Design a protein around this ligand. Sequence first.
Ligand SMILES: [Co+2]
Ligand SMILES: [Co+2]
Lengths: 331, 331
Amino acid sequence: KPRIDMHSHFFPRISEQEAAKFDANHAPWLQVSAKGDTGSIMMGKNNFRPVYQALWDPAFRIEEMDAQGVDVQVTCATPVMFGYTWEANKAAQWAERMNDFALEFAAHNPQRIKVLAQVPLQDLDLACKEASRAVAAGHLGIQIGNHLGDKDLDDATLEAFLTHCANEDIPILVHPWDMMGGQRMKKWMLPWLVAMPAETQLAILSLILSGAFERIPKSLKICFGHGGGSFAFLLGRVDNAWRHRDIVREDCPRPPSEYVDRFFVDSAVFNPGALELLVSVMGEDRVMLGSDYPFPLGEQKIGGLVLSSNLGESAKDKIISGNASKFFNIN
Amino acid sequence: KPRIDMHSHFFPRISEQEAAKFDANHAPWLQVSAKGDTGSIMMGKNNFRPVYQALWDPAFRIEEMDAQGVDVQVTCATPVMFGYTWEANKAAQWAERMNDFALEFAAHNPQRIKVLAQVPLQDLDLACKEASRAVAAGHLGIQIGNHLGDKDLDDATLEAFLTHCANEDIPILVHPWDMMGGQRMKKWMLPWLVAMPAETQLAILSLILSGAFERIPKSLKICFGHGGGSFAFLLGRVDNAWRHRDIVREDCPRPPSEYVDRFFVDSAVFNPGALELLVSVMGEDRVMLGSDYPFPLGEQKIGGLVLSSNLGESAKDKIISGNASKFFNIN
Ligand SMILES: [Co+2]
Ligand SMILES: [Co+2]
């Protein structure tokens, strides 16, 4: 019955000086206001996002984990630090620095704080090395964006990197980023409410419908962020469109809704009816408690939705604890 | 207990000659293969989509409605014919021609076939006239795309056109079209499975979060196509993000999940767990049987999902019959 939060974010103590070493416009860095209890993520010289002390001060973060019942948390890089847009070596150097930063982070109570490494996904080689280097170095797995410009998970680049980690028993977190839309969704944080779930839901079908779960070893432990996005809902549509149009069946040989046993999703759906539906489509043994701590939109009572539910008692424990522990190899 | 299908599509007997009158590249037209039992929608000279005889031959369509139990169907223009991209008068002339075509269509058994008019939404004036002209001419309401280039339903143009129809008791169907994504979702009909639900779900929040349901008279009967898209699922997230970020609350003064009494959705979700969830968020009196007949992805047993459900007996009738009849004023 320890409680494991497995989606969560961090950001390292990088000065504006160090970030200009890599790119004075597109590297990010952390800027603390005098007090040391607020601050903002900065893109070169612009204000990207306000954040608060939980995102860099792990000592503070353990106090908070105590006040929510979180025994073990898993953190990992904030989407922004991914820089998949960059030159392929500077990025592989950037990523080795972060996973190094992140490792000192969990080095504050590594029995409680577990990290997940980012990669330089543009070059397929660098990333395969970076991921096995940083999983031996300490991490429990890798966190990647769900798409690479116009390359979704179907692209053989990303299939390859997956099939590498399936073999090395390197668990994988896929996290939406670099949202679609272009111009239209500018106001009200729409990009987080419509684009983001849609991006994850796209990433999943980009495997099932490309038939990648037929070529990728069944060892692959892969989880998708924000409850799979609008998936467990839109599934019924995908099955229907596969029963009825040839060119949907083209490379997917079973009915899509059969591959719900090849991946996992977290619980971050924020609604007890949503969660029920989500579990029935995924199976009580494939949904894992995540919170998206500390960002503003991630349930401040971590676990609350899961325990304020109708769910069974075995189920509740599997999400909270079981599933995540089997997933990451936590004792 | 008559059964009313209220989402459905048609396309008129337009020759390639007539379509060049308006645009030899972007007007569409219907081309029948010799037999008169198959054919294809054509953009000038390209093959847009294959279709089958149900989409133009209403005599045939009544035979089919007999073999599904459909007593009254409501059809309306196929997204493609919208031409919101066009010069503003040619479009208002195009639209008056279609709603005229469509009227002869339902003029085959108008006690069974009911139509819904399209508009030239780019010019706000033309459309307000076109819509009251064609609702007196015979139609039961208007069907519009959910967005206008980069203008979503929040844009005051489209708020205005809504507030006009709320007053004239002109019911409204919002149908996704002109999907987002740009380049990435090219293969496997992804655009129908990820973009399309996302577009409808965006259109709905573009009202709630803009606060438009506060300025728009409560008379407004408006329905959203394809079960609201990934809405009833992602709602829990929207509420959460409104409880927690100021700039989401900026123009929305109640918690978003309260406006589920200002619109309706059809049933086209294709999964009994999806439908259950959809009804609980919308209320048995706000979900209406639709089928997306005849396009390939619209359940060939019309009503099957609704009656193959756990739902109550009053509920089942309200979706099938009740709600739609109150919605369109059908006796
Ligand atoms: Co996150
Ligand atoms: Co449709």
